[PDB]
Design a protein around this ligand. Structure first.
Ligand SMILES: Cc1cc2c(C(N)=O)cccc2n1-c1nc2c(c(NCc3ccccc3)n1)COCC2
Ligand SMILES: Cc1cc2c(C(N)=O)cccc2n1-c1nc2c(c(NCc3ccccc3)n1)COCC2
Lengths: 509, 509, 86
């Protein structure tokens, strides 16, 4: 419902309260462009907004227009536009816009250029006077001919991406209110488990869940989950993360630093405006590889109730090795649009490490330079090698602030044991501070592999004993397990290295 | 209004005073081509010039022409041209020219080549006798088929770029004269804050400012600023900068040098003509990275009331790594057109450093060679590494003059503290010369980070105390801050380096 | 040495941040040599014209060519090697 709100603020007031703007001496938007992956019911949404504004609705199924004989397409368009123009308040909704109006050298023929021209002239033709709004659909705005994202045409753009846990939950509830839902079924569980799913994938999931029951228990849902191949696995997930600061016990100095960098200018802007100094553009997290550099960045976004975007370095590598630096522009656009937000680069050193490369890192430069200061979008640069990052990135007005995100403290060790064991059976004779002390110099990773080794010893003992009980019938986790597990468990990062960050922390300063 | 003036000098006299030219034995321009980004109201401008000259006006909406069935396009064109020809004094204005007449191998079909041919023949067909002027629109002249920028056709070209503070202010006033403008609203503030905005973006800004009020205070404007995504962030901003020489206290020798290089030949040309010697083509700023090499270059432009253009080196890198050396030609064209001007290359060493590269630096060569001496466009080359610049650039008739832009003097330290603290609360027991003396060997950057650290200590103390006062209610900046801030603040550039510029200053000479 | 009280030594303390003893020393010595020079040059001038203490003039004269011995690099090197020696 959050989504509709925006589109109604953009539509309703200049569709059905138009005189105020045209008197106050401004313009309504005449081209609201919805985009985002398929499985999202943009059509549903458009008709929803048309019904709940009270406006004539005219669909333009792109395929349908493109399937006509050259001429009758333009005809159909003119027809549609006059039919709307006449019955207005009017929403003309263009489904699969990219079909009629693509990236326009991928157009081996002039008829399409005429068809697009037509749509441009029609788009130009409207008046705010005529009470007409044009909405349109596509996967990404990169798809559409840019001469549609002129001001005269599709000026306003809205992203309907992947839904998060809550959206997924809503959707599941909506598709499963009509269902033989068992008591052991957990919708929220599934909503949380359904990463990369969209409305469609969830619908399909509910559907297979039904069908395999009809061959509905939780088993069926989990099985259908086992089966489903979501569409938006590949799409860059933007959401506010739900890691609290107090989930990250200790690491305090960094908390307060990050707060002074990123929290104070969104939470007390009055002050920054008052003193006049303007905020850090962004940050750089360096230190040893066994830590939650990700999780801190999340935690500050969560703390500022701002969005979060992870660029895993394999995205970066994919760009360098392919020379698709273009897509940086698209990333920053995607952050910018989803303000306020932390754009988190993981392994910023990847491009530079792995040896248009300093260019991929450089596009990130040109984009940091060109991004408006005021837009509250922070930009955290992770590494373990301050030594390898193109130091231009560490020039003021870029990744100004360096932060040594060091090895976890005892409070934080505890925190991470807790995190790694959150959902698990853990008898109280696992004291975690016995584990805090023993694991001085340990990275998260080692605590983690301790916990995992323990858990695998537990599973092993469990099912080995169960099978032993099957064979003898056919005539929780405790510090036993753990000190067993630690009896082969590393200290990830050697003194050398930490001393190296120390040195390079001091002399970086 | 400044803009109109030119276009009226180019139009009015040969539209409505034509006999004088045709008698004096010359030709009027028959093709005035307006270009620049979208959001600029080139159409508005054309009709403005037509109304204020007193001439028939015929629009040719490119899309509209291209949307016709092959033939009826050419028909429409002929029709338009005869309709104008007949009612003349006549301005034929072509909106989105690039549509009908593109870069003409991006034309997978012969109909467009016919359509363009037609427009060429029509453009050829006119007489200054017939009292007809053709104006036309596009983003950049790179867009149009070059056989339109023949002499016979679109000979004269005018750039309507981004507007500067004043233009933005004018536009804001113009869109907001009809508005419930509060007393706390500051238009000039917003005009100054609206970098990369154009007429459209400003219109839209005013619009969201309205709409969010109607949910107008300064808050609404600043919020709408928080929201807006300007179009011309990416466009190379040309404007005369407003940094005085006396803003740059000290660094005197360089002032006078730069004056003798760049000021004397625009301000006393009589002399240069008289003695006969012809001016320096350009300059090279080298020295330590903590200084306002940019700001000096600005300051001399400001001093000569000439334009300014920064090529950040990431532009250069983007060109090298992409091998789009082409665009150098475009840059110099853009400077040349916006004469007089300083073309400021930042980090000229980037291409050469980062290792068609010496070629990107080399295109800059061919362009410096090919640029007309007389055109008053200076060309300042920044670095910190005279040692790495292709020394061909330092060959006479290129970057003849080298200038060591060294570390700031006490007057200049003061100047920079002042600049860094301009808008800030600063009690008079912050003496800045206590700060001058202590910061011998410091770069601007260090003064800056002193000031910023101070300011952050101030903000910290402030909001920490305010939150403490919230918790205790639920039962300016002073040299305390500063000597606090200096108690961890560097000296950026080490003796080694400065000695290295010394050496390389002497033996460069 | 003869040193009038308008040689404040803290004016000299502040200006000589990052200086080694050696530099303070060569400041003092340069001053003293400027003083001796001025002195006996003036005395010989007074011999020739008869046959018809040290003050911050001298010192800011002397500092107007006086080094900072040890560069940031080095001190940072002892810092580093002080930390990692420990
Ligand atoms: C599951 C997990 C693995 C892991 C690792 C790892 N290399 O396996 C490293 C650091 C934190 C880690 N966490 C982790 N995950 C979480 C939390 C938490 N504790 C606080 C913390 C975070 C980052 C930093 C310090 C301490 N730790 C907090 O609860 C939510 C998730
Ligand atoms: C705010 C600021 C930061 C900064 C830096 C820096 N390393 O961050 C370097 C150089 C100038 C800088 N400025 C600066 N900014 C300005 C001015 C000015 N001082 C005059 C001057 C410039 C260069 C040289 C001498 C003296 N300095 C002049 O007023 C307008 C802006």
């Amino acid at each position: 419902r959050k989504q509709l709100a925006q589109i109604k603020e953009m539509v309703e007031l200049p569709l059905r309260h138009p005189a105020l703007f045209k008197a106050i001496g401004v313009k309504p938007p005449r081209g609201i462009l919805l985009y985002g992956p398929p499985g999202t019911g943009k059509t549903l949404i458009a008709r929803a907004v048309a019904n709940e504004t009270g406006a004539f609705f005219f669909l333009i199924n792109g395929p349908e227009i493109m399937s006509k004989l050259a001429g009758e397409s333009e005809s159909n368009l003119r027809k549609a536009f006059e039919e709307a123009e006449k019955n207005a308040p009017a929403i003309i909704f263009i489904d699969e816009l990219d079909a009629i109006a693509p990236k326009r050298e991928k157009t081996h023929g002039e008829v399409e250029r005429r068809i697009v021209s037509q749509l441009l002239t029609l788009m130009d033709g409207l008046k705010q006077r005529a009470h007409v709004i044009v909405m349109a659909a596509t996967n990404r705005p990169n798809s559409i001919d840019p001469a549609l994202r002129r001001f005269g045409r599709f000026d306003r753009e809205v992203d309907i991406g992947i839904p998060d846990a809550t959206g997924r939950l809503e959707i599941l509830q909506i598709h499963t209110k009509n269902m033989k839902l068992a008591d052991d079924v957990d919708l929220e569980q599934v909503a949380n488990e359904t990463h990369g799913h969209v409305g469609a994938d969830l619908a399909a999931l509910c559907s297979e869940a039904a069908l395999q029951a009809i061959r509905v228990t939780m088993d069926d849902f989990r099985w259908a989950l086992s089966q489903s191949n979501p569409s938006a696995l590949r799409e860059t997930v933007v959401e506010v993360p739900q890691v609290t600061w107090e989930d990250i016990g200790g690491l305090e100095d960094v908390k307060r630093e990050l707060q002074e960098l990123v929290q104070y200018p969104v939470e007390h802007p009055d002050k920054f405006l008052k003193f006049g100094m303007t905020p850090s553009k962004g940050v750089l997290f360096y230190g040893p590889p066994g830590c939650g550099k990700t999780l801190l960045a999340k935690a500050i976004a969560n703390e500022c109730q701002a969005n979060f975007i992870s660029i895993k370095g394999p995205e970066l590598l994919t760009m360098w090795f392919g020379e698709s630096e273009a897509n940086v522009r698209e990333i920053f656009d995607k952050a910018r649009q989803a303000a306020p937000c932390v754009l988190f680069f993981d392994e910023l050193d990847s491009i530079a490490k792995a040896r248009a490369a300093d260019r991929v890192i450089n596009q990130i430069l040109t984009e940091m330079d060109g991004m408006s200061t005021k837009k509250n979008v922070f930009i955290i640069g992770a590494t373990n090698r301050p030594d390898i990052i193109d130091p231009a990135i560490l020039r003021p007005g870029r990744l100004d602030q360096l932060i040594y995100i060091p090895l976890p403290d005892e409070k934080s060790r505890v925190a991470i044991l807790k995190a790694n064991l959150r959902k698990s059976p853990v008898a109280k004779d696992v004291d975690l501070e016995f584990l805090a002390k023993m694991t001085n110099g340990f990275s998260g990773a080692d605590l983690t592999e301790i916990c995992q080794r323990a858990c695998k010893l537990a599973i092993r003992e469990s099912i080995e004993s169960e099978i032993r009980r099957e064979r003898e019938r056919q005539t929780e986790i405790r510090r036993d397990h753990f000190e067993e597990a630690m009896r082969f468990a590393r200290r990830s990062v050697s003194d050398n290295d930490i001393r190296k960050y120390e040195m390079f922390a001091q002399t970086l300063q």
